[PDB]
Amino acid sequence: QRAYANVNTSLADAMAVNILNVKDARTNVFWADDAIRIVSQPIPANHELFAGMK
């Protein structure tokens, strides 16, 4: 399990939480291409079961 470590230390008891967005700002987004996907499934309204609608 320790082979998957990312942070160097565990959360302590009294640790203060910093807030990185202090002020309103317009974002700039960057990623490696692989990170985001779009999953899409078809909706079968062409099936025999729907005979009313075109």
Place this chain on the structure above:
Amino acid sequence: QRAYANVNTSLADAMAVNILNVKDARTNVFWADDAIRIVSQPIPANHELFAGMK
């Protein structure tokens, strides 16, 4: 404009109007033909948005 004048005299200030219905008698109507226009227009139900019906 005077070509359209159908009356010899404009309305005075104090002038007696005369209502001609003193009784409930049932009408007898006469007109010169083409005095009543009947306007018609189709209802377009054949459109593809209506496809769920004949």
